[PDB]
Amino acid sequence: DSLVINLNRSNPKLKDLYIRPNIAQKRMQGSLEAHVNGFRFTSVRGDKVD
Amino acid sequence: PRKGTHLLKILKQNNTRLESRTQLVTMCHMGPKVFMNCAGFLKIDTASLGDS
């Protein structure tokens, strides 16, 4: 299902996290945000994973 | 201005955002009257706050 964009204004978040497997050729530093029905991982560039 | 600067300096030294108005009394040690006066005029955007 599609990521229900956070209409809730709080949304816990964590920062500084290397992801495995690598989205690109090498690891990508990013942050994580807990959404209403899932997590969204956003790299420093802008790669969004749900 | 004197109290505003003092409050901002305390916040910078703590290196933490004003998560709640109760912080003004706990960590900032603001007086009861000063708190009663300046409580309903300090917005704490919980939307942009995110994590505590």
Contact indicator for A8, A23 with CB cutoff of 8 Å: no
Rg (C-alpha) for chain A, rounded Å, is 11
Resolution of this entry in Å? Answer: 3.1
Short-list B32, B8, B12, B14, CA closest to B22: B32
DSSP state of A41: E
- Tell me whether residues A13 and B50 touch, CB distance under 8 A: yes
The coordinates were experimentally obtained by cryo-EM
- Residue A9 touches partner B, C-beta closer than 8 Å: yes
CA-to-CA distance for B37 and B52, rounded, in angstroms? Answer: 25
Residues of A in contact with B50 (CB under 8 A): 10-13
> Each residue of B18-50: b (16+ CB within 10 Å) or e?
beeeebbeeebebeeeeeeeeeeeeeeeeeebb
B3 vs B8: CA distance, rounded Å: 9
Do the Cβ atoms of A40 and A33 come closer than 8 Å?
yes
Min Cα separation B50/chain A (Å): 5
